[PDB]
């Protein structure tokens, strides 16, 4: 992360080596590079000037001020750049490293004061290997305290379900957190075994239904707070 002193918060796109960066004629090649596309629609003209009083304050030894509602105008700075050998406008006359001949249109230069913010891409290394749905709090890896990575909250699954493809949505369902085919039903059956349910091994009530543990936790926590427990099945076939 960079800032600029002008709410112009770019990021390192490339990282070029020395020999490829443009060199003016003296020998100066940029540290940073901006492109003139942050300005004309943000209109920070408080930056096309900071690069005048940098390059005019060092080429002369000065140490300039542009202060709120005062400052140092463009004319004296232009004349300073003249006195130490540059344009009024401080626009250098650069040749291009890559190929070795002059850029066709001149190239702004001079000192800026780049701040270097927090919030980098190393404090922001995060990834998740697997997420099951637990038994302790019966949760998937939501947000933090389990891993970094994602959190498909309100608007996120709102987008997820809004696709328009049938078993793309089915796959998202089947891979969401867990799809354990545990055995449970209404006719003498509950959250137990499949082949021989020690709850009720009637041998006719085997279901093996895909279900996340969240619905099972709902079953449990609503056992205390009574509510209609509808439970049934239906044929996938004809």
């Amino acid at each position: 992360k960079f800032s600029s002193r002008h709410g112009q918060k770019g990021v390192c796109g490339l990282i070029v080596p020395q020999e490829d960066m443009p060199f003016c004629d003296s020998g100066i090649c940029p540290d940073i590079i901006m492109n003139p596309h942050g300005f004309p629609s943000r209109m920070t003209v408080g930056k096309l000037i900071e690069l005048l009083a940098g390059k005019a304050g060092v080429l002369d030894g000065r140490f300039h001020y542009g202060t709120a509602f005062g400052g140092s105008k463009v004319k004296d700075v232009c004349e300073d750049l003249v006195r130490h050998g540059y344009n009024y406008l401080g626009k250098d006359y650069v040749t291009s490293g890559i190929t070795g001949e002059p850029l066709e249109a001149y190239i702004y230069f001079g000192p800026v004061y780049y701040q270097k913010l927090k919030h980098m891409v190393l404090d922001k290394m995060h990834a998740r290997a697997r997420g099951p749905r637990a038994v302790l709090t019966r949760q998937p890896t939501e947000g933090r305290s389990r891993d970094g990575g994602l959190r498909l909250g309100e608007m996120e699954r709102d987008c997820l379900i809004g696709y328009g493809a049938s078993m793309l949505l089915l796959e998202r369902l089947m891979i969401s957190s867990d799809a354990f085919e545990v055995d449970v039903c209404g006719q003498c059956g509950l959250l137990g075994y499949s082949g021989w349910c020690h709850y009720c091994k009637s041998s006719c009530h085997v279901s093996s239904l895909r279900i996340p543990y969240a619905c099972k936790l709902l079953f449990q926590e609503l056992q205390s707070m009574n509510i209609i427990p509808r439970l049934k099945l239906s044929k996938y076939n004809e």
């Binding site: 596309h37 408080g46 709120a68 406008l89 702004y108 089915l170 998202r172 545990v182 075994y193 020690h198």
Partner: protein, 1238 residues
Amino acid sequence: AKKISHICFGMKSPEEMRQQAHIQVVSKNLYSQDNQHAPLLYGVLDHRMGTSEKDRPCETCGKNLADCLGHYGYIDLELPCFHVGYFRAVIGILQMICKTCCHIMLSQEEKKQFLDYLKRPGLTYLQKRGLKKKISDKCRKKNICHHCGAFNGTVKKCGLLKIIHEKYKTNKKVVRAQENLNPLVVLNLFKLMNPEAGKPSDLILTRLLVPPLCIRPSVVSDLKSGTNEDDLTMKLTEIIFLNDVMEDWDFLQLQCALYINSKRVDFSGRTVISPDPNLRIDEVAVPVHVAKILTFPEKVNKANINFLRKLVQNGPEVHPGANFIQQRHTQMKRFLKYGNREKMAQELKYGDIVERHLIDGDVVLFNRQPSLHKLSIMAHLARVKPHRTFRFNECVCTPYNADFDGDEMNLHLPQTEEAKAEALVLMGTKANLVTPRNGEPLIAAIQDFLTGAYLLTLKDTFFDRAKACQIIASILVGKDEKIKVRLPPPTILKPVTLWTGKQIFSVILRPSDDNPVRANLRTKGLCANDSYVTIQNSELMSGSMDKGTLGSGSKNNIFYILLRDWGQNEAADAMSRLARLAPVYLSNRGFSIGIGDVTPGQGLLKAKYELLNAGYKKCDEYIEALNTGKLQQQPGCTAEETLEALILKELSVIRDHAGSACLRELDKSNSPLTMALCGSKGSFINISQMIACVGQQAISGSRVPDGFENRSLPHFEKHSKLPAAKGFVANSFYSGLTPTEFFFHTMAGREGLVDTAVKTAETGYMQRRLVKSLEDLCSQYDLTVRSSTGDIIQFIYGGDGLDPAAMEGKLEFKRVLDNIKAVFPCPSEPALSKNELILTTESIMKKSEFLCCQDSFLQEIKKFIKGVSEKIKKTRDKYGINDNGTRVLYQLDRITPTQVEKFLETCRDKYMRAQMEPGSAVGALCAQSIGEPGTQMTLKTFHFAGVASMNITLGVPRIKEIINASKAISTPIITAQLDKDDDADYARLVKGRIEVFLPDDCFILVKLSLERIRLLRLEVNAETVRYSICTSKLRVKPGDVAVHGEAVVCVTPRENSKSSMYYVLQFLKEDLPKVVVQGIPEVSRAVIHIDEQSGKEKYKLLVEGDNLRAVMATHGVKGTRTTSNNTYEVEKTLGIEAARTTIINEIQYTMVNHGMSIDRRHVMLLSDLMTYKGEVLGITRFGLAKMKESVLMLASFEKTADHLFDAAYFGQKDSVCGVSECIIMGIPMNIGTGLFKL
């Protein structure tokens, strides 16, 4: 066989609850207390009773931890206690049983109500208890019409107490255990009538049962320091002292109430984003240390085993490798720090399943917030490139807002290959470039590609054969493009051979093609041409690109000329040749905004100073005038601050002059000039705020109000508006500003910080609510939508059956002419005046799509209009071949039989391709179409509007009012026409037709200003005043009729003799106000629009009072065009599809503000959702009485609360059973195509 198909909550099945019983109360202590140790005890907190520790004998399940589904067990306590919920029920409904008789609810009756209850859906039986809410126990015992009145018992609301005396009623109350009733009689009287489900008897709080220990985690510190658990219902074991044993029941239930009653993530990752364009459009790339994130099925196949073992041998610290591989015997083995492995018997050791890293897609998903479109998470490729960014082809930053502050981004990992192939070839190449919400491309040259390519196209740039270098990052280039290139010929042979800049852009030499374009962003006439580019078959005839001819335009692009004709796979590969051709040209030319790019000359600063003088002069003239008024305002109407509109538009003239001075002498070899000549970055009102005049700011589409008394800022003079005391900056950011032009900048600046900060106030709710309410929409193959019960919503998609997916150029009659222009079948010529030959081709047309038919009703409806279109084409060709030919045969006037046959074949192709159902998934697309265009744009649309009154009222937040249809709407504005086609006076007569003196003493009431004031306001009469004052002589208080008053030429309203000597009060007020001067008897002010629109003079009535039928007697009228802007009122006043069309147009006024034109079929679908039952109950955010809709939306009360608990205690069902529950419940979807039945 069968997974879940219909499931709801779960409860205590008493049998299987209590076979797993181990201990109810072993002793006074638990957790192995008395042992002075903790081996495992005591038999209930251990073994299991619900698997809350590392291992023990899981009951009916096994083994630890998961797959030990919550184990039950009888832990009964038998503490005396009763139904707290039915305590409240008995208190409220006042002894609904009519205790202690419990006689039959109804008598004979009228069995009509009997059969009506027995032949109606549920959630209705509450009406029986409602009828007996009061009459219970206060009636005739053993009588007709009911059987209650027994036995004088009504319940008292003494808190949770239920005191039932033998009440009179209201005469038998006592205070301390007398005249009481016991819930046991209620229990016996059980031993709204449905014991199949609604049993209050078995809910007795004496056989309490526990949920299993899977709710509760215990953090045993391995140190015997803290084992807290929550909550839970078993805790009452510590009340064994009181377990040995009417107010006593209340105390027991109070003790009970303490502890009895009240798709997230998988395989993810997040880092920061900084992309490359070297990644081909479909491809993407991730970091490298995401390969260190693993445990993938990638189930081994026979053809794969060797290629898998190649990477299996690598292990923990090599990128192309494997780790944690799942073994054949369900015991997965690691190659991490405990690896020392990879002998790998070559066909069996992992003969089932393996798990590698990200080598090649192997698709990954990318998250964004907010996800405006469904195209904020799409499907795209891999492999793999380092430097832990989120790199991807930078032409598709628009649908992600991949913002570049360095703020991080979220990556998925899909580890299931079932619909992964389905996902990767449906939303990977067709999702990106074409959206149904807008019909406009999302992928586009974001930036400098626009200006780099533009500069290429500029008529100046002349190149070198030595500049075949930059060619070769495009079509002699990275993977999947290295054919040759045909070296476009030497397009000069002067003393100096040279390559023009255009057919260096128009370069590719594999799979030749054809195209056409026009109409860039410039003027008309050969006017230094930057428009009507007129691309022919992959060359570049004239023109110079732009955001509307190389970026996210509408109908002229590198997509809608290279997606339709020629297909896919040739648009995602001309964008890459741009992405590497153009932006690696700038690196040889350079853009550098210096200062001289934003310095106006010192030879046209004059045009700002002199206009400042003139402007301030005229504004001062008027501001002086408003104290004397010699000009004058009035007109305006009003005129106090109507020396606001004039000064507003004078400063507007100032800024327009200044701007136009900011954009004339700019020498064309300029930056931002060349970032607004090309829509690239910024516009013509930002090369003006940086040169001449940043004025004028506003606040709410109005200059800066006061906030000190009568003056805005204190650094000014009292009561003196001007272009300085009320914000008007006049200093361009070049010569920046003054501290009375900055503080009027961070107060319109604080709009874009409040605009973009309460944008996410209404949208955050409405988006999720629209998604939650509108999922069930499907597109089954009969061309008809259906619902949760398969109820018809549509029959076609508007006759056409079309949906905005294939919205080719104008649909599909003008662009395709160009499409067949570019592939020339030379042999034909004008000899026979081919118009008749064109008619013969129309005949072969008539034959060639009467073989049309299939899933149909999409071609005959437009087949005849096709015929008419080719007929008019033939007529135009006849006119041309006659007059123009009245010798190159007039260019041969190309048209040939081959071209028209190809034309009709292409027409049939696109008409039959754009066919939805079959398919089609039309619902959520329309939902978000109507939703997010409320989120994006509020800036340049509702504030210009700068600055004027007269009919600009509301924008996006009208969506809230349309959806909710709430009666608190403060704009019930009801438009309607008049004697419309007239002059100001002609309609003004009816306008007037649309629609105050000393009260005295000593036997006299009042008078009236019955003089020409009324005769010049509106036609009424003193007799009308008498008639009005006769009407109740007041509002809401009993004045008189008095039959009658006003016995003089001017009213003498005869204050009725002081029979109620109380008040002359009403005698004054009830006559003081207006009675015959409201024009609707309940309305706010009327309105008039004497406005010249659509050429002629229009005249409307913007009345603001419900409801319609107010326009019965507007003898104007114009009754055909009467309209409204309130859904529920037009529901009853006007027709059903009238209200449907009003809902269509209402949401199509919130989107005419600038840009946004969502598909009309989307609002058509929403309106069809509005009016299932005809009687218009629009989809509200809280519920509807429309049974063919989805019952899920009813539950979404924003949000679930104690009401569901109260309904649960009453045995009432829940309405969360739609399809948004499916994602939390984890079942396959079944509609349209998920309902397979062989």
